[PDB]
Scaffold this motif. Structure first.
Motif, PDB file in Angstrom:
ATOM      1  N   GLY A  35       0.362  -1.611   0.508  1.00 15.08           N
ATOM      2  CA  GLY A  35       0.036  -0.066   0.125  1.00 15.08           C
ATOM      3  C   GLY A  35       0.658   1.728   0.456  1.00 15.08           C
ATOM      4  N   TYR A  36       2.192   0.862  -0.427  1.00 19.92           N
ATOM      5  CA  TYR A  36       2.799   2.373   0.247  1.00 19.92           C
ATOM      6  C   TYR A  36       2.755   3.223  -1.329  1.00 19.92           C
ATOM      7  CZ  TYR A  36       4.377   0.695   4.199  1.00 19.92           C
ATOM      8  OH  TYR A  36       4.216   0.590   5.233  1.00 19.92           O
ATOM      9  N   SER A  37       2.669   4.194  -1.505  1.00 20.10           N
ATOM     10  CA  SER A  37       2.404   5.335  -2.366  1.00 20.10           C
ATOM     11  C   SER A  37       3.761   5.608  -3.234  1.00 20.10           C
ATOM     12  CB  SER A  37       1.944   7.021  -2.362  1.00 20.10           C
ATOM     13  OG  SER A  37       2.804   7.232  -1.036  1.00 20.10           O
ATOM     14  N   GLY A  38       4.650   5.552  -2.995  1.00 19.57           N
ATOM     15  CA  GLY A  38       6.135   6.143  -3.290  1.00 19.57           C
ATOM     16  C   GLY A  38       5.605   5.699  -4.711  1.00 19.57           C
ATOM     17  N   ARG A  39       7.099   6.361  -6.202  1.00 15.27           N
ATOM     18  CA  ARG A  39       7.158   5.354  -6.667  1.00 15.27           C
ATOM     19  C   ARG A  39       8.601   4.696  -6.663  1.00 15.27           C
ATOM     20  NH1 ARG A  39       4.636   5.459 -11.577  1.00 15.27           N
ATOM     21  NH2 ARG A  39       4.701   3.223 -10.591  1.00 15.27           N
ATOM     22  N   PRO A  40       8.460   3.015  -6.996  1.00 17.15           N
ATOM     23  CA  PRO A  40      10.023   2.269  -7.143  1.00 17.15           C
ATOM     24  C   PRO A  40      10.708   2.998  -7.872  1.00 17.15           C
ATOM     25  CG  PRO A  40       7.605   1.179  -7.484  1.00 17.15           C
ATOM     26  CD  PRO A  40       7.662   2.813  -7.415  1.00 17.15           C
ATOM     27  N   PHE A  41      12.125   2.796  -7.083  1.00 15.43           N
ATOM     28  CA  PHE A  41      12.794   3.450  -8.902  1.00 15.43           C
ATOM     29  C   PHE A  41      14.226   2.095  -8.208  1.00 15.43           C
ATOM     30  CE2 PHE A  41      16.601   6.044  -9.686  1.00 15.43           C
ATOM     31  CZ  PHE A  41      16.677   5.672 -11.554  1.00 15.43           C
ATOM     32  N   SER A  42      14.778   2.144  -8.813  1.00 15.08           N
ATOM     33  CA  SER A  42      16.150   1.436  -9.018  1.00 15.08           C
ATOM     34  C   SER A  42      16.878   2.095  -8.119  1.00 15.08           C
ATOM     35  CB  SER A  42      16.851   0.346 -10.143  1.00 15.08           C
ATOM     36  OG  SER A  42      16.258  -0.011 -10.667  1.00 15.08           O
ATOM     37  N   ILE A  43      17.629   1.127  -6.589  1.00 14.23           N
ATOM     38  CA  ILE A  43      18.671   1.964  -6.208  1.00 14.23           C
ATOM     39  C   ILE A  43      19.681   1.305  -6.888  1.00 14.23           C
ATOM     40  CG2 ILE A  43      17.278   1.846  -4.058  1.00 14.23           C
ATOM     41  CD1 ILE A  43      18.847  -0.579  -3.194  1.00 14.23           C
ATOM     42  N   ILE A  44      20.559   2.117  -7.164  1.00 19.29           N
ATOM     43  CA  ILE A  44      22.358   2.085  -7.871  1.00 19.29           C
ATOM     44  C   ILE A  44      23.460   2.365  -6.750  1.00 19.29           C
ATOM     45  CG2 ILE A  44      23.284   1.892 -10.071  1.00 19.29           C
ATOM     46  CD1 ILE A  44      19.541   3.614  -9.432  1.00 19.29           C
ATOM     47  N   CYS A  45      24.316   1.832  -6.242  1.00 22.62           N
ATOM     48  CA  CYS A  45      25.160   1.559  -6.325  1.00 22.62           C
ATOM     49  C   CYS A  45      26.049   2.868  -6.785  1.00 22.62           C
ATOM     50  CB  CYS A  45      26.419   0.263  -5.944  1.00 22.62           C
ATOM     51  SG  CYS A  45      25.930  -0.444  -3.296  1.00 22.62           S
ATOM     52  N   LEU A  46      26.049   3.825  -6.854  1.00 20.48           N
ATOM     53  CA  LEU A  46      26.804   5.503  -7.081  1.00 20.48           C
ATOM     54  C   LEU A  46      27.553   5.645  -6.374  1.00 20.48           C
ATOM     55  CD1 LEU A  46      23.954   6.762  -8.972  1.00 20.48           C
ATOM     56  CD2 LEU A  46      25.889   4.668 -10.146  1.00 20.48           C
ATOM     57  N   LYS A  47      27.319   5.916  -5.128  1.00 19.33           N
ATOM     58  CA  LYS A  47      28.716   6.664  -4.233  1.00 19.33           C
ATOM     59  C   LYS A  47      29.232   5.365  -2.720  1.00 19.33           C
ATOM     60  CE  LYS A  47      28.687  10.193  -5.750  1.00 19.33           C
ATOM     61  NZ  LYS A  47      29.922  10.967  -6.340  1.00 19.33           N
ATOM     62  N   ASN A  48      30.828   5.664  -3.370  1.00 17.33           N
ATOM     63  CA  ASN A  48      31.849   4.920  -2.190  1.00 17.33           C
ATOM     64  C   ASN A  48      30.747   3.478  -2.128  1.00 17.33           C
ATOM     65  OD1 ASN A  48      32.563   7.309  -1.927  1.00 17.33           O
ATOM     66  ND2 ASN A  48      31.766   7.531   0.123  1.00 17.33           N
ATOM     67  N   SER A  49      30.570   2.301  -3.565  1.00  9.22           N
ATOM     68  CA  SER A  49      29.747   1.651  -3.361  1.00  9.22           C
ATOM     69  C   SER A  49      28.186   1.725  -2.508  1.00  9.22           C
ATOM     70  CB  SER A  49      31.094   0.105  -2.707  1.00  9.22           C
ATOM     71  OG  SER A  49      32.170   0.680  -3.692  1.00  9.22           O
ATOM     72  N   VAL A  50      27.541   2.653  -2.492  1.00  8.05           N
ATOM     73  CA  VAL A  50      26.595   2.355  -0.863  1.00  8.05           C
ATOM     74  C   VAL A  50      25.393   3.417  -2.324  1.00  8.05           C
ATOM     75  CG1 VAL A  50      25.360   4.100   0.128  1.00  8.05           C
ATOM     76  CG2 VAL A  50      28.379   3.095   0.597  1.00  8.05           C
ATOM     77  N   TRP A  51      23.905   3.036  -1.902  1.00  9.35           N
ATOM     78  CA  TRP A  51      22.830   2.806  -2.806  1.00  9.35           C
ATOM     79  C   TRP A  51      23.107   3.952  -3.007  1.00  9.35           C
ATOM     80  CZ3 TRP A  51      22.042  -1.245  -5.310  1.00  9.35           C
ATOM     81  CH2 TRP A  51      23.468  -2.326  -5.262  1.00  9.35           C
ATOM     82  N   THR A  52      21.472   5.114  -4.119  1.00 10.96           N
ATOM     83  CA  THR A  52      21.890   5.857  -4.382  1.00 10.96           C
ATOM     84  C   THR A  52      20.774   7.062  -3.614  1.00 10.96           C
ATOM     85  OG1 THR A  52      20.332   5.388  -5.444  1.00 10.96           O
ATOM     86  CG2 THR A  52      21.773   5.269  -7.004  1.00 10.96           C
TER      87      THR A  52
END
Length: 122
Positions: A35-52
């Motif tokens: 039931g969550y509203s949010g627009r899903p999007f991919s999380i990408i390891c872009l920073k310091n091998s950490v997610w966006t």
């Protein structure tokens, strides 16, 4: 690398079940589900091998307390908000047949209390 982004109740990514760690520039499939509203999007390891930014992707809706108890007595255990719970006490020595303790949960576009309606046995 990423050391597994973390467990997100909102989302159950398809790939994360047996893999958990990925190279930079890798997109993961996150879905908002219960039931969550949010627009899903991919999380990408872009920073310091950490997610966006997997934070607050999917959203909780604000809850309400205008239904009020007939007596005028309701108690806020957790809060009015989502995941929170309240008491509908008409009297100390009485029974409330339905939802004495309303709980606010996500229906999808809104949050409702599991309360059927105010009830007082007296």
């Amino acid at each position: 690398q990423c050391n597994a982004p973390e467990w997100l109740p909102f989302a159950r990514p398809t790939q994360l079940t047996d893999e958990f760690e990925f190279p930079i520039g890798t997109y993961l499939n996150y879905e908002c589900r219960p039931g969550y509203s949010g627009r899903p999007f991919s999380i990408i390891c872009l920073k310091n091998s950490v997610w966006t930014g997997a934070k607050d992707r999917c959203r909780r809706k604000s809850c309400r307390n205008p239904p009020d108890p007939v007596n005028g007595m309701v108690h806020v255990i957790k809060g009015i908000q989502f995941g929170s719970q309240i008491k509908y006490s008409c009297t100390k020595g009485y029974r409330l047949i339905g939802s004495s303790s309303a709980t606010c949960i996500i229906s999808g576009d809104t949050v409702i209390w599991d309360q059927e309606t105010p009830i007082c046995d007296r």
